[PDB]
Design a protein around this ligand. Sequence first.
Ligand SMILES: CCCCCCCC/C=C/CCCCCCCC(=O)OC[C@H](CO)OC(=O)CCCCCCCCCCCCCCC
Ligand SMILES: CCCCCCCC/C=C/CCCCCCCC(=O)OC[C@H](CO)OC(=O)CCCCCCCCCCCCCCC
Ligand SMILES: CCCCCCCC/C=C/CCCCCCCC(=O)OC[C@H](CO)OC(=O)CCCCCCCCCCCCCCC
Ligand SMILES: CC(C)CCC[C@@H](C)[C@H]1CC[C@H]2[C@@H]3CC=C4C[C@@H](OC(=O)CCC(=O)O)CC[C@]4(C)[C@H]3CC[C@]12C
Ligand SMILES: CC(C)CCC[C@@H](C)[C@H]1CC[C@H]2[C@@H]3CC=C4C[C@@H](OC(=O)CCC(=O)O)CC[C@]4(C)[C@H]3CC[C@]12C
Ligand SMILES: [Ca+2]
Ligand SMILES: [Zn+2]
Lengths: 129, 663, 194, 117, 44, 52, 484
Amino acid sequence: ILKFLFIYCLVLLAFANGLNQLYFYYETRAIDEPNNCKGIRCEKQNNAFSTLFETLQSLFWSVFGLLNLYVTNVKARHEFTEFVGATMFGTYNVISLVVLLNMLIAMMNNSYQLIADHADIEWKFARTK
Amino acid sequence: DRIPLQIVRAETELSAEEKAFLNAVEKGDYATVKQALQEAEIYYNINCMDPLGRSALLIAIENENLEIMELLLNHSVYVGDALLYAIRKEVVGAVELLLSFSEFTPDITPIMLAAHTNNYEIIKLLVQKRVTIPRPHQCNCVECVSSSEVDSLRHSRSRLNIYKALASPSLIALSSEDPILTAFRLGWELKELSKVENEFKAEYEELSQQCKLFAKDLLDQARSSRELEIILNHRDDLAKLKVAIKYHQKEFVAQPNCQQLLATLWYDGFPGWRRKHWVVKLLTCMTIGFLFPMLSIAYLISPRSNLGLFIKKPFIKFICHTASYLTFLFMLLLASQHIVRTDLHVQGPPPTVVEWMILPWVLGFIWGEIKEMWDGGFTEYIHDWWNLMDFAMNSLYLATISLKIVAYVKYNGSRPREEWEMWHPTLIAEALFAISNILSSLRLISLFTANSHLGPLQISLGRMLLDILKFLFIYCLVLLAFANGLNQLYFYYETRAIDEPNNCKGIRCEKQNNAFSTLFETLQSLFWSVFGLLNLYVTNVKARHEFTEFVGATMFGTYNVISLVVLLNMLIAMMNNSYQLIADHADIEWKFARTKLWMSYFDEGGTLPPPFNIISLIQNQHYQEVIRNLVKRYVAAMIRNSKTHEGLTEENFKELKQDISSF
Amino acid sequence: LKIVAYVKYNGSRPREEWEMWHPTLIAEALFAISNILSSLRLISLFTANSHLGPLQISLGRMLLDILKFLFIYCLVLLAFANGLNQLYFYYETRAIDEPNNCKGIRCEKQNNAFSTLFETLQSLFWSVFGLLNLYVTNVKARHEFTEFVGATMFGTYNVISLVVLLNMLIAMMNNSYQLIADHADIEWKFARTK
Amino acid sequence: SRLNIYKALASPSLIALSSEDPILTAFRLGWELKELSKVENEFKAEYEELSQQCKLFAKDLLDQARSSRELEIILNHRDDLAKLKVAIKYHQKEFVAQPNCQQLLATLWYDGFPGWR
Amino acid sequence: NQHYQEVIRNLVKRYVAAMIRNSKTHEGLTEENFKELKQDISSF
Amino acid sequence: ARSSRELEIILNHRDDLAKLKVAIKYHQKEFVAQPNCQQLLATLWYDGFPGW
Amino acid sequence: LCSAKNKKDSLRHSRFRLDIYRCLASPALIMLTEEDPILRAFELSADLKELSLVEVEFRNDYEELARQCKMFAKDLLAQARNSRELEVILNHTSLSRLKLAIKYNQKEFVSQSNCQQFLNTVWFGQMSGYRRKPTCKKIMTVLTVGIFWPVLSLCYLIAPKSQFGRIIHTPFMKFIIHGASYFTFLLLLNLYSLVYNEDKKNTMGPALERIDYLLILWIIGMIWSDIKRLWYEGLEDFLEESRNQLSFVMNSLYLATFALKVVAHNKFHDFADRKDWDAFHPTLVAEGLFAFANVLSYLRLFFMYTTSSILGPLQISMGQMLQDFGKFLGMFLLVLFSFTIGLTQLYDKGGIFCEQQSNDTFHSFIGTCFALFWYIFSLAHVAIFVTRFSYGEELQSFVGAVIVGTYNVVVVIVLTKLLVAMLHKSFQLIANHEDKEWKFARAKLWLSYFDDKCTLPPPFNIIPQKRDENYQKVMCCLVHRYLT
Ligand SMILES: CCCCCCCC/C=C/CCCCCCCC(=O)OC[C@H](CO)OC(=O)CCCCCCCCCCCCCCC
Ligand SMILES: CCCCCCCC/C=C/CCCCCCCC(=O)OC[C@H](CO)OC(=O)CCCCCCCCCCCCCCC
Ligand SMILES: CCCCCCCC/C=C/CCCCCCCC(=O)OC[C@H](CO)OC(=O)CCCCCCCCCCCCCCC
Ligand SMILES: CC(C)CCC[C@@H](C)[C@H]1CC[C@H]2[C@@H]3CC=C4C[C@@H](OC(=O)CCC(=O)O)CC[C@]4(C)[C@H]3CC[C@]12C
Ligand SMILES: CC(C)CCC[C@@H](C)[C@H]1CC[C@H]2[C@@H]3CC=C4C[C@@H](OC(=O)CCC(=O)O)CC[C@]4(C)[C@H]3CC[C@]12C
Ligand SMILES: [Ca+2]
Ligand SMILES: [Zn+2]
């Protein structure tokens, strides 16, 4: 599992770098937002890809579908930039959820079958320890 | 109420005297057969055959009795195809006796059958008589064309029989000057054939696997390092290893002794690297990376010095290149900090400090890529997937630079960023730079093959990407179908951006609107529903037509069911099946890939990291003496493993009891 | 239907004033369904290719077990839908009493999700994909026992549907594909010969 | 008794000796034995095994052609590729998927394009 | 029909011989060994 | 082993169950999980609880 | 005395006992020494299975001896040649032999072709022509019998010996009549809300309608059959079947809602709107129990899938994979309790069912458990904004978000994938015995309809030396055939 988390961390770092490079020109201030809340832990999510730390947090929570889709919009309404950002987010979603999770499922299936043939002996060794 | 049973195709029955002669032949009574043949000569049948077709000579061969066979041959009995029947049983004595309806196709010769049976003694016995085998054509020649039209079945059978005869390990060992090179070329050619002849794929793949196994097993007989170096360095520098790599001989490359020689070459200047604590290795790797600029500069200032020669070792080359790439990536990560860039409202910006530092790395990457491509050629560049990624990344960087130059010259003044148009050169340049950063940071995965824990897993994951495209085609077809339907249904109720709140139109707004109003938007909406990011209220319409809304909702639900309950689980099952098959050969593939990576640093053509780069008869005699020893040991081995039968010993003990009774 | 609509109606009218069963709307819906069905026929051309053929055949042979699973899921869904509709049918509210004149769960504020059996079946269908909000179990009268029972039943349905059946189906589909994969070549060649 | 009779009638040697058209007899017997397995649920395995044996006998009998003329004679026999159509009608997948029959079908299908491969 | 019966005759003959090969050779060789050994010696 | 006395002699030999501890130190999992050793260990473990 | 020996040498004592039992379970010894080899194999096989449980260390050896005993009795039955011998063997008393095999869990014995052929004849009875009918003709026969079930059940009541009276006596039609009787009970429940007067929704003491009396008659009928089955068989045999357990709970829930309904009509009869009643008013409690019992009524139809030969094997396979789900419940239950402790410690010092979900879900132990429960699906039921403190606590808000993120990875990514890994492994082992397990379950279900103790459907039920010598002759033939 850690062996897979290494690859996932590499992919996440790459996509976070790209998204933060694209979206950092439009950072706003906390006082300019309703309720004076800045970030993705607010009632209306904003500034999702403004800083590298916030980009990492946003990409982590999108694995469980907890990041909304309007965070890719910008106030200036530059359609090319928003389309490119949405495409980056979609590519990350496809790679992370359609590919890596299923490969993890397959590898866990294979490893368990080999481990299962000796479960009793290892359990009894642990129990006598 | 009954089914009558009667012979439909009747064959003439033998006479009583012929049946008695047959029984005497089978019983092995030489006197009775001699008397019967003498009576036959007096009356003026040995040529008679059974309804099964087993003649007296064939039964005599089948019973392995040399005396009756010798006596029958003395009386001018018909021979026919007795040699083939003797060869197929693999009895030497009958074969030498013979040399001194049918069960076989008319295109089979004794040498072909001997090669098929893979019997060293019989093949050797036949070769001394100067036999020949036709060479198969590579073909639009008139002879091949006419043969194919006249009878395709015979032509294909004959071709398969010839290739089966040629690919016999014993024949290759006995009659080839260079058995290893012959095995390599025959394996490659046989592998190419299975793609052309789709019907007979399995036999050709089996023959290719047999050739590969023979080539691998020949190398296992080396007993000293001198023999191994002679074999691997023979040129028709490690020429033999490069030839084996060219022909995709994974098992030959992944042999333990070949790997040991490569490991010795790789860890040049590091004695007992394996005998070190993991901490010491980690500290050693860190310091060399920190000192990488000093080592590169020393080589440029003075190659002859010790520091100049330090970079020549392949492991140091690898460490320095990795450190340089890591530094480039870290500098890329630092270009998005708002501390470096002060103003954002300048139409044409001159490059900042970070971009000035970055540019030499990009120039070095481009120069190295074009140099590699020019040296290797187009095919070898196209062969590796990673080189394609490099080409895309470098093209994107070049486009970024070209767009940055135009904006600076064209625009002088400063404007608010919200006033710019959509197709502004600065925005396009920034987007291209971001995509380039994404592509660059993903290249680090190609360095996983050098590790023993993360290498085989990377190889297995990379081998599972072929089926995903196959499934993606079907998914794209289904998506296009449902998008067509939904856009056909929902395109009558398109609203304007002014009517919507906040003045936002699309499914990328806090309140999703116009989800299925256009084909492009329909495709985007159906893509995002896979991850659950499309809300259910987008199927409603302002006019409140219940039938239309219900039809659209049912379309959406059917698409959701098909996409998420059927196809996803199907993909999971397919990728599970593929992983189990791949896992059984992961070690050999990983060793092949790591060997390919290692030999890329043995050459001295490219030494500097990217930022610094821009600134024979006697040999044949020794090879033949080693090859002779390997073949001699190989033959004595395969006989002991499989050519050893308890049943053959049984009749020998019966013969010993016969000899004891005679004594 | 298009000919009937052409003959019958001979005047222009605002589209929002048309009734629910106007012939033009039915014709358009049937045309859209026909387009969906027509576009899906291209899968039958995959058997002519040596790469996409065996995969198409194997996917075809795997559709028999999914229906057997769906029958059992249908039984479970019917049971839970009957229970929820029996519990929640007293608190049915009219469309006038709701904001924007909504009734049902196709609205921004989902409501009356368990008031009828048909709507209950639709609501339970959409919970598999997570498109039903958790506040639909609330009661305007604010009765604690009823809301507790409804939430417990909804949670039990979600657990049974998404934690047990889906994983069972995954394992079953894994086993079936491995057996099918062995004979893919012969079946694909038979299909291509046909 | 019925099972014993059907098992006796499905012997490859008996079919070879006593049948006028062994291939058609094998096809019909395999189909009939496959249909009997559903009605007689108690003996499903035996009837399935007998049907498989009949199919294998027919395929192995086809496997012994030594020329294209013999293959054409076998495939074109009518009691136009009539035998192939009869095999398709009876779900003889292994018989149809034989490499020589597939090669003949390919040379029929790719007419006008020599050396397409 | 005459041509078809000719071809069927050849195929059946080849099929019978092939299946006999797997059943008969080992058994025949084993039987001929011991039986020949136990009667000729007695006659001698 | 055919008797309990032989099993005790083998398991208690010291160059307290010293042999068992030595086997545990060397990760002899198949040796330790033998049914007779497990029976003896269970007898030692459930002392004061007959027929547990 | 045996305890004294075990103190001196327990390894020798255990080995001697296993040596004796391996001698007793010899197929050759049973045939030569026992009068009833089939019954001896049944009793010994059940004896050796129990010994495996007590002798945990000798588990493998004992269950190998039990398997050997089971395979011997199945091979003895395979030597029967005609139906006369089959009826003699399966009807002997020491269908007593057929019922004895079901009690002793002889799955191999039941799945034999001779045993399966015998079951089919008894199950269909005089309607053996049903098997000759085509598929299109079979369905019309089942639908006709099911639709006219009240008439056929009534005909047996007045003229049991008539032609229509004896129709129920055959097991196959009895199963259909009982099945159609239950399908009408479920139809009455569906129609209960449709015929509900809207004026009664604001009535606090509503009286029992005519439809309510119909449901009471069925419930007594279903209950009455339940004591009869329990009384004739026993507690342990009756409690073992899952279908019987589901009938226990749903019958108590149906009595509670009607007991509360009568009391409410006699105590609380006020006319007031629904919005003004107490939360725990008896009328509201009565409707909560009624809805719960409707779910358990529809879930009883799972046993009817066993008869089908298409959905039968699949349903049995899913039943055996439910045992692996219980083990994962124990580990997940501790993980959910661990994160509940820390999360309520951090936020209480400073719910999810509202349209705007707030931080108040973490202010109680019950609320915290519910919020973590809805995170398992990964369908975004709960938002991240819930973790943020209402007034400030910038640092404590971040720590709470990290705690929730760790919970998601542990459960949704690690525990869920581990659960799928074992279902892949266990199913492959189960798939091997799919046919043998389904046939044993179907024969167990069929045998319950052979007894004439319960013949009428539930609404109608409430209304008021010679053979031993033959067995020995067959036994010697079967024994001597087996040796040959
Ligand atoms: C470790 C590395 C592993 C890499 C594995 C790669 C496997 C193959 C995946 C490739 C990624 C594809 C990226 C492009 C598509 C995603 C981006 C996107 O749509 O942008 C949306 C953006 C913004 O809405 O829109 C578009 O780009 C245009 C609309 C595209 C709609 C059709 C998409 C076709 C592909 C669908 C793939 C679905 C896969 C799951 C199926 C269950
Ligand atoms: C790639 C090639 C695929 C070929 C075909 C594969 C099989 C496709 C068949 C799927 C069955 C679809 C049945 C209708 C469902 C979609 C229509 C619908 O409900 O739209 C909403 C609409 C409108 O709200 O709802 C209805 O019209 C009725 C809703 C109640 C009935 C629900 C039926 C559920 C059927 C099983 C669902 C299983 C879910 C996962 C279980 C683990
Ligand atoms: C029963 C026992 C089973 C095994 C238990 C151990 C399993 C191994 C994993 C342990 C989980 C460790 C904690 C991970 C999540 C930390 C909390 C968190 O990030 O909350 C967000 C919080 C709050 O917004 O943000 C941060 O913590 C800031 C840093 C986030 C950086 C991005 C994520 C880093 C990589 C995480 C990979 C996790 C696996 C993903 C696989 C697709
Ligand atoms: C912050 C950004 C720039 C990402 C930083 C990532 C690096 C710190 C890591 C990620 C993957 C690592 C690589 C993963 C595996 C290997 C193989 C490893 O192989 C060996 O020679 C040692 C083990 C062995 O003897 O088999 C050498 C280091 C290397 C290239 C690693 C070098 C350091 C890398 C690039
Ligand atoms: C997927 C969506 C976007 C529809 C648009 C793509 C179509 C134009 C493609 C998709 C599938 C294609 C078919 C897939 C496979 C074949 C078999 C192919 O037959 C061969 O030549 C096979 C050769 C071989 O055996 O390798 C001929 C084209 C055809 C019908 C293709 C025709 C073009 C199709 C319909
Ligand atoms: Ca390159
Ligand atoms: Zn040629």
